[PDB]
């Protein structure tokens with residue numbers, strides 16, 4: 229995927245010059261959101277879709293949370309440049325205009341928007357059964373960040389504290405692996421540790437807007453990272469310095485996936501493994517950061533940034549990424 | 550589709566209050582773009598995808614212009630609130646990370662961005678063969694319009710001149726009907742007026758940014774409408790006043806579709822029928838508007854706004870929509 233994407237990324241970089249010295253002049257591609265110069269502030273812009281989680285939703289008939297997944301993944305990405313999320317449009321590409329599906333989808337859209345503090349301001353609905361084998365839900369969000377307040381990881385230095393905020397579960401990455409591995413053997417009604425498999429696979433992605441906005445207005449913050457596609461590898465987008473981490477015990481849906489033969493080094497590159505969002509702060513801020521975040525969600529001191537470069541060492545699992 | 554979508558639009562309107570009195574406060578849903586209050590200016594935001602035209606692109610191994618379609622449809626919608634397009638992100642949902650396809654897509658992304666004057670600032674690439682039977686390309690664009698300079702149709706008055714700007718061809722609406730009607734009967738290589746059927750179906754959507762921005766900065770403009778899904782019915786989004794129009798001769802792919810039994814009232818509700826964009830100006834501006842638009846594309850007087858509220862009368866075809 230990265231190799232195919234290189235030609236699109238290189239072309240996109242060549243279009244930056246079209247806004248050079250004008251409103252909308254962008255920063256570089258590669259971070260969690262694009263930053264556009266509006267003079268007194270930057271507009272942040274990001275887009276993402278739910279993914280094949282929606283095939284599980286359709287299989288069992290539970291659609292009232294995929295709209296939470298859509299809103300969560302987009303607003304969480306805005307947070308990772310330091311931005312306040314403001315507004316979103318949704319792109320809904322569907323096999324058919326099933327009114328019941330749309331009614332359920334709208335319930336989760338409302339819940340997620342209310343939790344994130346964003347208005348849903350427009351969208352697109354495309355009925356395309358030749359192209360879409362389900363109900364593909366995506367969106368684009370915009371946020372605002374003041375000049376001088378952008379947080380992209382540039383200030384991360386060896387010694388900094390690395391703190392994890394718990395995920396609600398699988399969130400919206402790794403669903404293809406989980407679906408193909410687990411559904412044929414167990415079925416979606418299989419009970420694992422008190423929850424059916426569809427409950428594990430459809431648990432809505434957590435929204436981190438309130439804790440992160442409180443955090444960045446309270447302490448010095450050097451980096452912010454949503455743990456999405458690529459798992460812990462997302463940390464390498466913030467910095468070339470290394471990480472030395474102790475990750476939480478493997479539990480819930482991740483434990484079942486591991487027990488069905490996925491090695492841990494692969495799982496840390498695919499799944500969030502219990503940590504949905506990671507923040508990097510100077511050590512003197514660690515205690516206050518943990519206090520703030522813990523009032524919202526279970527949060528952990530994971531480890532330290534290191535002078536050793538380019539590696540993520542998960543010490544308690546013997547893994548290096 | 551309208552009934553299913555009402556569930557989502559009802560919920561979206563309920564989220565507007567989350568930005569009441571704050572940066573990002575939106576206007577209402579229903580126009581070609583969302584307008585968000587940023588104090589001194591509105592941000593305009595819209596999203597749309599190419600559609601099943603990509604299945605023709607795939608068959609002939611030519612994705613070189615699909616990026617033009619995606620950019621055109623998004624920047625043209627921004628024009629219809631009076632906004633200058635600035636930046637876009639693309640959402641590329643693919644059955645495989647095919648490096649040939651991606652290299653082709655990048656070519657048209659550059660050409661479309663350069664013609665529209667926008668930067669491509671980010672995106673999402675989702676490899677999802679279980680969900681996507683092809684390569685679906687969509688995007689989201691943002692633009693800017695100053696307070697006092699929004700053009701959404703409220704100033705349209707009876708007697709105003711209605712001017713059409715020619716389309717390049719089918720653009721990106723009505724492709725499923727055209728594909729299902731023509732491809733299994735004629736074959737993709739069927740030659741019609743010197744072009745193969747696939748060339749008719751794949752012709753990239755026209756970009757109207759340069760003529761429309763020159764127009765709005767030179768003459769009084771009362772309404773702007775891209776002729777996309779719904780065909781001429783899009784005009785009713787601008788005003789409750791009526792329209793009396795003479796539409797161009799039915800030519801090219803539209804003639805072939807018509808000769809295969811689609812009724813003309815349906816075709817004016819599905820296809821652009823040769824008119825890709827419509828502008829509404831006071832009569833005294835008509836000649837100056839035609840001169841400005843005709844620098845860039847074939848453009849012509851279509852008719853006038855009337856007091857026959859809610860009717861679109863295509864006089865020369867005897868069709869009332």
Ligand SMILES: Nc1ncnc2c1ncn2[C@@H]1O[C@H](COP(=O)(O)OP(=O)(O)O)[C@@H](O)[C@H]1O
Pocket residue numbers: 318319320349350351352353554557558561578579580581582583597626777778
């Ligand atoms: N899934 C959706 N969610 C929210 N708003 C939508 C959705 N689909 C369409 N809309 C809104 O409905 C209006 C009509 O949309 P559409 O039919 O896609 O036409 P257009 O692309 O010409 O705006 C627009 O204001 C659009 O923002």
Ligand SMILES: Nc1ncnc2c1ncn2[C@@H]1O[C@H](COP(=O)(O)OP(=O)(O)O)[C@@H](O)[C@H]1O
Pocket residue numbers: 233236237240257258259260261262276305456457639640641670671672673674
């Ligand atoms: N199709 C695309 N076009 C332009 N930029 C893209 C595209 N896909 C991904 N990107 C950019 O590459 C970077 C990584 O994207 P992605 O892998 O989706 O992770 P994330 O969602 O965590 O940003 C982002 O900056 C994104 O904007």
Ligand SMILES: [K+]
Pocket residue numbers: 259260261274275276305672
């Ligand atoms: K992103």
Ligand SMILES: [K+]
Pocket residue numbers: 456457458462
């Ligand atoms: K990612």
Ligand SMILES: [K+]
Pocket residue numbers: 351580581582595596597626
């Ligand atoms: K639109």
Ligand SMILES: [K+]
Pocket residue numbers: 777778779783
């Ligand atoms: K439309």
Ligand SMILES: [Mn+2]
Pocket residue numbers: 275276301305456
């Ligand atoms: Mn993301």
Ligand SMILES: [Mn+2]
Pocket residue numbers: 351352353596597
């Ligand atoms: Mn649309």
Ligand SMILES: [Mn+2]
Pocket residue numbers: 596597622626777
């Ligand atoms: Mn549109």
Ligand SMILES: [Mn+2]
Pocket residue numbers: 275276672673674
């Ligand atoms: Mn992404």
